[PDB]
Each structure stands twice: as structure tokens, then as C-alpha cells.
Design a protein around this ligand. Structure first.
Ligand SMILES: Cc1cn([C@H]2C[C@H](OP(=O)(O)O)[C@@H](COP(=O)(O)O)O2)c(=O)[nH]c1=O
Length: 129
């Protein structure tokens, strides 16, 4: 896989961000994760954590997996990095998301994220408390 450049347009929530990619605005849906919705327990905390991570970053990058690059809503499906740190992995590692939506052929970082989830659960963090 390869990291490519993008710039933040707007933080949305834990699950999605508006980024400029190849010069066009897109909504990105993070691969392999599901955060609680804003109304749900830890939803506001997941959005805040994401917002801070991507707004404070000097450099945003997107990393497509091997499979489909857009979902049925036209959302880009990627791993997002903020100053080299994966936002997908970070949410999971903090117990602010669960590993989810693992489809065959777009699952390169599945085991990395499942290890993060094991650690968050062992530490009883947030959703795992
Ligand atoms: C994360 C992801 C979601 N989706 C679609 C599946 C779900 O369909 P449905 O909308 O029919 O439930 C939807 C959930 O995304 P959200 O968690 O953002 O609501 O996103 C994909 O198709 N591929 C993906 O990799």
C-alpha cells in the first residue's frame, strides 16, 4: 500500500472526514472501524478525538487498500494518517472504535487493528470500560 497526500477540509466525526484528495473534495469513510454515533455513548468523545488528531496534524495522508476505493454512498474508503499516525488504529487503540466492516480484499491492516482492540479491551478503555 501507498500513502498519498490530502488536506483536511472539515472534520465530521469518528467514522468520516471531508478531505481534499487529488484536488477534489471527498468524504472519507475510515476502513475497518466503527465508532459510536454522536447520540451514542462515547460518540462525542470519538468525534472530538478524531477532530483533534486531524486538525492538529501538519500532514494528512490517505492510504487505499487493494479493493474497492469508494463505497455505495460515494465515500472514499481508506486508512487516514495524521503526521504518520493512523487515525483508524488510534481510535481502536483508545477504545473509541471497534474493528468492524472487515471485507475480503480491503483488509490489509485487520490484524494490526485487532491487536489495538485487544490492548484497549485489556486496559478497559472507554467503550471497553
Ligand atoms: C466501512 C465500510 C462501510 N460500508 C458501508 C456498509 C454500511 O452499509 P449500510 O449504510 O447499508 O449500513 C455502511 C455503514 O457505514 P457507517 O458506519 O458510516 O453508517 O457503510 C462499506 O460498504 N464498506 C466499508 O468498508
Amino acid at each position: 500500500l501507498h500513502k498519498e497526500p490530502a488536506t483536511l477540509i472539515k472534520a465530521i466525526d469518528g467514522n468520516t472526514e471531508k478531505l481534499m484528495y487529488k484536488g477534489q473534495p471527498m468524504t472519507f469513510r475510515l476502513l475497518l472501524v466503527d465508532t459510536p454515533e454522536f447520540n451514542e455513548k462515547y460518540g462525542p468523545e470519538a468525534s472530538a478525538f478524531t477532530k483533534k488528531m486531524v486538525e492538529n496534524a501538519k500532514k494528512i495522508e490517505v492510504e487505499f487498500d487493494k479493493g474497492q476505493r469508494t463505497d455505495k454512498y460515494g465515500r472514499g474508503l481508506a486508512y487516514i494518517y495524521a503526521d504518520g499516525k493512523m487515525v483508524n488504529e488510534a481510535l481502536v487503540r483508545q477504545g473509541l472504535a471497534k474493528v468492524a466492516y472487515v471485507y475480503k480484499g480491503n483488509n490489509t491492516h485487520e490484524q494490526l487493528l485487532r491487536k489495538a482492540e485487544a490492548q484497549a479491551k485489556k486496559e478497559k478503555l472507554n467503550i471497553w470500560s
